[PDB]
């Protein structure tokens, strides 16, 4: 040749789409043993012409969340005991989604889901099941909470100590060269929190990326941590398909349901000032923050005063952040995996020649930062199995000039207390029994309360702001190290000079 909603009513009944001729989705379930390897169950619990009621999959750049609901029959047999009738046993989930329009496009997910204190199975001789989804670096390291002290280890040397997983996947740390700087005193503290939150909190303060990634042929999970984006990643992020076009060719406009905005590139900011309230820092105290995005005007006479707390130490500098402005986020919806685009999360570009979005006409290339997948079993196919799927896919699209890393929510930790004994050397004479000695540079070298004394102090025998870089030697217990390091437990810490004293 108004009434496209009646197509969607028959779609939730069964199908009625175009030009989706075939859609076979599968799940391969393999158990994970004591030593974090794979057992043998065809070697799995293959799902097919749907036994699956509902699967939710959302995924960011870094990871995958989501749930699952399928059906089996019947009770009771030994083949399904160990898998789905016990908590605290990990499970691989290999999802393979094949479509055919005429050419084929394959998406593939790998995920581990296991959870203490939760099993959900329903009845009325057909038994439902409900399983969660996480990417394997999360769900393994979620139930892992160590806390120790490492000395003279760098970050790529720290994470590879705790990475007890090589028969499943691997993580690429060979491109960063910020996570290899030797830290002299590393205090790992997952006290009241996860270790995976520690994995990301020190990843945010080095400004890195993560990528979940699978090979489609065949499944090998690999995590990537690179400080920037180059062609060294994007060699390995080639979408292993053919005829992958861009620029919203007009088969896309045939397959949409909505367009939803989130906020846009604004034109006003709030003046955010920065105060270090300190006597004896004889420079400017107030300084204004710096914005990476110009052509933006401030408001008038509205402030945000971001103070810094004052320690006994000579107060540090300066936490040079930026005023985090707003970017650009379009939510889309669909009823298909889109023909003739790259709806597969690479960190690559998608051009603009058409203005069939809200968007802005002043926008360069684009990228995709999320996907969401609701797959529901069709109600006509429900009764057929009961006697003897659907689609709704969203997207996130952002400006390529605002390419910044995204991070999940985490927990800032709480402190923990250590009792500590002070020593000086090893051979202590009985006339040098209770002496004292001061240490320069994280090594047993003598120093003094002179030599640092920033000059309003040279000068007499006074200290102002109780300067750093002067360290005691403190022995601790021998059981707050790793299980393999033959070091000697000695923590160097700066002086509170006013402990056994007064202002005299």
**Contact between 421 and a second copy (CB under 8 A)?**
yes
Torsion of CA 161, 164, 170, 173, to 10 degrees: -10
Q: Which residue(s) pair with 483 in the sheet?
A: none
Indicate which single residue of 250, 436, 455, 478 sits in contact with other proteins (rule: CB under 8 A): 436
Indicate which single residue of 16, 83, 101, 148 sits in contact with a second copy (rule: CB under 8 A): 148
- Give the HSE-up count for residue 416: Cα atoms under 13 Å, Cβ half-sphere: 14
Residue 6 binding result from a second copy, other proteins, none, given CB thresholds of 5 to 8 Å by partner type: none
Q: Which residue(s) pair with 373 in the sheet?
A: 57, 393
C-alpha triplet 298, 300, 304: angle, nearest 5°: 75
User: How many Å apart are CA 440 and CA 423, to the nearest integer?
Assistant: 16
Q: DSSP letters along 343-410, please?
A: -S--S--B------SSS-TT---EEEEEEEEEEE--HHHHHHHHH-----EEEEEEEGGG--------
Do 334 and 391 meet the contact criterion of CB atoms below 8 Å apart? yes
Indicate which single residue of 14, 296, 363, 449 sits in contact with other proteins (rule: CB under 8 A): 449
**Contact between 488 and a second copy (CB under 8 A)?**
no
Find all residues with CB under 8 Å of 414, minimum gap 6, and list them. Answer: 191, 192
Indicate which single residue of 11, 106, 326, 453 sits in contact with a second copy (rule: CB under 8 A): 326
Pair of tokens at residue 439: 């240490």
Do 343 and 333 meet the contact criterion of CB atoms below 8 Å apart? no
User: How many Å apart are CA 99 and CA 24, to the nearest integer?
Assistant: 7
User: How many Å apart are CA 278 and CA 310, to the nearest integer?
Assistant: 8
Residue 147 binding result from other proteins, a second copy, none, given CB thresholds of 5 to 8 Å by partner type: a second copy
**Contact between 462 and other proteins (CB under 8 A)?**
yes
Indicate which single residue of 372, 392, 437, 444 sits in contact with other proteins (rule: CB under 8 A): 437
Indicate which single residue of 307, 428, 435, 497 sits in contact with a second copy (rule: CB under 8 A): 307
**Contact between 310 and other proteins (CB under 8 A)?**
yes
Do 281 and 310 meet the contact criterion of CB atoms below 8 Å apart? no
User: How many Å apart are CA 223 and CA 213, to the nearest integer?
Assistant: 6
Angle between helices 379-387 and 5-13 (to 10 degrees): 20
Q: Measure Cα distances from 483 to 141, 220, 477, 479 in Å.
A: 19, 31, 13, 9
Of the two residues 1 and 462, which places its CB atom closer to other proteins in the complex? 462
**Contact between 466 and a second copy (CB under 8 A)?**
no
User: How many Å apart are CA 436 and CA 497, to the nearest integer?
Assistant: 13
Q: What is the CA 32 to chain-centroid distance, rounded?
A: 24
Indicate which single residue of 54, 143, 193, 437 sits in contact with a second copy (rule: CB under 8 A): 143
**Contact between 302 and other proteins (CB under 8 A)?**
no
Q: What residues from 24 to 63 belong to the interface with a second copy (CB under 8 A)? A: 34-36
**Contact between 164 and a second copy (CB under 8 A)?**
yes
Q: What residues from 314 to 373 belong to the interface with other proteins (CB under 8 A)? A: 315
Q: What residues from 97 to 116 belong to the interface with a second copy (CB under 8 A)? A: 116
Q: What is the CA 54 to chain-centroid distance, rounded?
A: 26
State the nearest-atom distance from the C-beta of 479 to a second copy, in Å: 4
Do 98 and 24 meet the contact criterion of CB atoms below 8 Å apart? yes
Residue 3 binding result from other proteins, a second copy, none, given CB thresholds of 5 to 8 Å by partner type: none
Total residue length of the chain: 504
**Contact between 279 and other proteins (CB under 8 A)?**
yes
Of the two residues 104 and 286, which places its CB atom closer to a second copy in the complex? 286
Residue 34 binding result from other proteins, a second copy, none, given CB thresholds of 5 to 8 Å by partner type: a second copy
**Contact between 235 and a second copy (CB under 8 A)?**
no
**Contact between 353 and a second copy (CB under 8 A)?**
no
Indicate which single residue of 478, 484, 486, 500 sits in contact with a second copy (rule: CB under 8 A): 478
**Contact between 22 and other proteins (CB under 8 A)?**
no
Of the two residues 235 and 297, which places its CB atom closer to a second copy in the complex? 297
Residue 447 binding result from a second copy, other proteins, none, given CB thresholds of 5 to 8 Å by partner type: other proteins
Residue 74 binding result from other proteins, a second copy, none, given CB thresholds of 5 to 8 Å by partner type: none
Indicate which single residue of 89, 465, 482, 485 sits in contact with other proteins (rule: CB under 8 A): 465
Stretch that binds other proteins, among 5-13, 147-155, 336-344, 430-438 (CB under 8 A): 430-438
DSSP state of 500: S
Indicate which single residue of 448, 477, 487, 488 sits in contact with other proteins (rule: CB under 8 A): 448
Among 40, 210, 201, residue whose Cα is nearest residue 136 = 210
Q: What is the CA 103 to chain-centroid distance, rounded?
A: 34
User: How many Å apart are CA 468 and CA 452, to the nearest integer?
Assistant: 9
Do 411 and 153 meet the contact criterion of CB atoms below 8 Å apart? no
Residue 89 binding result from a second copy, other proteins, none, given CB thresholds of 5 to 8 Å by partner type: a second copy
Stretch that binds other proteins, among 232-240, 355-363, 377-385, 433-441 (CB under 8 A): 433-441
State the nearest-atom distance from the C-beta of 459 to other proteins, in Å: 10
Residue 504 binding result from a second copy, other proteins, none, given CB thresholds of 5 to 8 Å by partner type: other proteins
**Contact between 146 and other proteins (CB under 8 A)?**
no
Task: Tell me the number of residues near a second copy by CB under 8 A.
Answer: 80
**Contact between 497 and other proteins (CB under 8 A)?**
yes
- Before 430, cis peptide (omega within 30)? no
**Contact between 450 and other proteins (CB under 8 A)?**
yes
User: How many Å apart are CA 35 and CA 51, to the nearest integer?
Assistant: 31
Binding residues vs other proteins (CB under 8 A): 275, 277-280, 285-286, 307, 309-310, 312, 315, 435-438, 446-450, 460-466, 497-498, 501-504
């Amino acid at each position: 040749i108004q009434l496209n909603k009646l197509r969607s009513s028959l779609s939730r009944y069964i199908g009625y789409n175009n030009v989706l001729q075939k859609q076979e989705i599968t799940i391969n379930i393999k158990p994970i043993n004591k030593n974090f390897e794979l057992e043998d169950i065809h070697n799995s619990l293959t799902l097919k012409n749907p036994h699956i009621e509902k699967l939710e999959v959302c995924e960011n750049i870094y990871g995958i969340n989501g749930w699952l609901t399928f059906d089996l029959a019947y009770i009771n047999n030994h083949k399904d005991f160990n898998f789905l009738l016990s908590p605290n046993q990990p499970i691989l989930l290999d999802i393979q989604i094949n479509d055919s329009f005429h050419h084929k496009r394959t998406t593939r997910f790998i995920a581990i889901g296991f959870n203490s204190n939760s099993i959900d199975i329903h009845e009325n001789g057909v038994k439902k099941f409900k399983i969660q989804f996480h990417d394997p670096l999360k769900a393994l390291w979620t139930k892992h909470k160590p806390s120790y002290i490492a000395l003279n280890k760098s970050l790529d040397d720290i994470f590879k100590d705790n990475f007890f997983f090589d028969s499943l996947f691997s993580l690429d740390t060979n491109k960063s060269n910020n996570l290899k700087i030797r830290i002299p005193q590393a205090f790992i503290s997952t006290v009241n929190r996860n270790f995976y939150d520690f994995f990301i909190q020190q990843l945010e303060q080095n400004k890195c990326y993560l990528k979940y990634f699978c090979d489609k042929k065949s499944g090998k999970v690999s995590y990537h941590v690179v400080d920037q984006v180059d062609n060294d990643l994007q060699r390995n992020i080639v979408n292993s398909d053919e005829d992958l076009k861009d620029k919203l060719s007009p088969y896309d406009i045939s397959c949409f349901k909505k367009q939803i905005l989130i906020s846009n590139k604004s034109n006003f900011y709030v003046k955010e000032k920065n105060i270090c309230p300190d006597v004896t820092l004889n420079t400017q105290r107030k300084e204004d923050r710096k914005i990476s995005d110009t052509l933006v005007k401030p408001f008038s006479s509205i402030l945000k005063d971001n103070l810094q707390s004052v320690e006994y130490i000579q107060s540090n500098n300066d936490d040079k952040q930026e005023i985090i402005t707003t970017g650009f986020e379009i939510l889309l919806t669909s009823r298909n995996t889109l023909p003739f685009l790259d709806t597969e999360i690479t960190l690559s570009k998608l051009d603009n020649d058409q203005n069939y979005l809200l968007g802005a006409t002043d926008i360069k290339s684009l990228y995709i930062s999320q996907r969401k997948l609701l797959f529901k079993r069709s109600k006509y196919c429900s009764k057929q199995l009961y006697e003897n799927h659907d689609n709704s896919i969203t997207y996130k699209i952002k400006d390529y000039s605002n390419l910044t890393p995204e991070y999940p929510k985490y927990k800032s930790f709480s402190n923990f207390y250590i009792n500590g004994r002070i020593t000086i050397g090893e051979n202590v004479n009985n006339d040098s029994k209770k002496a004292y000695k001061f240490f320069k540079n994280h090594k047993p070298e003598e120093s003094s309360i002179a030599e640092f004394q920033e000059n309003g102090e040279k000068g007499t025998s006074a200290i102002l702001n109780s300067k750093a870089d002067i360290l005691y030697a403190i022995e601790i217990a021998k059981e707050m190290l790793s299980d393999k390091s033959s070091d000697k437990p000695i923590i160097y810490l700066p002086l509170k000079v006013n402990i056994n004293s007064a202002n005299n």
